[PDB]
């Protein structure tokens, strides 16, 4: 009787393939970190509505990062920081402007899929990787599991909430 399997305690684990992790952000800061330690490093940070330009500290893969953050929208902003190699620097790759405070991540087809854009029109976008199987994630917030075959429902949630 459930589409939303959960919510699950924040944890570190290797998610199975073909399942959306629907992560519910409670407060500002790091929402999750994920990597395979080879070619894929991503971390999403959450900035609350109506935040003028300010400097904030975030721990990413055990590294202190100081980012300047701006949020002029009435919605929350979820910024994806990405790098593709050990010696690389992190850069902003994607932005999700959402008033539902939900992000999503899926491992499928040899790629990592997330949501970005502005709700209720957010869409999925892919990141190529040569080692999907070794990708793990530390989720800092409670989360749900939806099968990829029910991605439509996941979409709706991310775009409209509960």
């Amino acid at each position, epitope marked *: 009787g459930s589409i939303l399997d959960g919510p699950y305690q924040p944890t*570190t*684990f*290797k998610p199975p393939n073909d399942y959306w992790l629907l992560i519910s952000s409670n407060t500002d800061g790091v929402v999750y*970190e994920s*990597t*395979n*330690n*080879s*070619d894929f490093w991503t971390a999403v940070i959450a900035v609350e509505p109506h935040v003028s330009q300010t400097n904030r500290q975030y721990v990413l*893969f*055990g*590294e*202190n990062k100081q980012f300047n953050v701006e949020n002029s929208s009435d919605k929350w902003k979820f910024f994806e920081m990405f790098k*593709g*190699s*050990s*010696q*690389s*620097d992190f850069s902003n790759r994607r932005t999700l402007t959402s008033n539902n405070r939900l992000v999503g991540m899926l491992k499928y087809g040899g790629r990592v899929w997330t949501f970005h854009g502005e709700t209720p029109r957010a869409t999925t976008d892919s990141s190529n990787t*040569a*080692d999907l*199987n*070794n990708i*793990s994630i*530390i989720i800092h917030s409670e989360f749900y599991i939806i099968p990829r075959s029910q991605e439509s429902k996941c979409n709706e949630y991310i775009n409209n909430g509960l």
Partner: single-chain antibody
Amino acid sequence: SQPVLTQPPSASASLGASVTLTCTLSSGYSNYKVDWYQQRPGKGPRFVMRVGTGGIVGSKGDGIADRFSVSGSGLNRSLTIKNIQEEDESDYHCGADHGSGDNFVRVFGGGTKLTVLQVQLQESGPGLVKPSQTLSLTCSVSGVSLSGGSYTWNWIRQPAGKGLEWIGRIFTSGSTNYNPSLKGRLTMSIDTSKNQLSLRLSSVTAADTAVYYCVADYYYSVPDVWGQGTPVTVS
């Protein structure tokens, strides 16, 4: 192994003074980060600090005193020790990652001998091995489950020349990266259920005489974790 790390063989310092050990990158790698390692007398290496051109990256290692700072500019990467104690007399090693995915390699400096005026890894081996035979090493891990999936496990040897040599790394799935300098003589395995890491090196020669170390690399932290190594002497 495109980048080259240059460390002076020896450095000297007096008690209570300051000294700066340096590691110089080859041209074209000004953005690269390097790890510093401290190998105390009668011990194997331990992690010290990671530094790029913007200072320290991540946390410093366990047991590293606040007298240890770290900096970088241009191709220079520096480990500075102030108010030097005699326990600071040690060998100091420079390491750096290069590449991603299939072409990954780890390069090391020659090492600098400074003279002063949780997760546990245990490596086991034969001790003595005859040439042309196959060297079989194991390493037991006790801090974590090898089926967790958030660790990369490296093997690093210290052969003739006294500088560290990265030989390979294995991931939880069993995927591997080997050093090309070893041909295909090196196979690395992971035993999920026995929590064990295993290594085979075919057709060994005097060039393979070395101390072999297993190094845990947690996905979400900077400091390494070393076993204390297994001596291997090729007949």
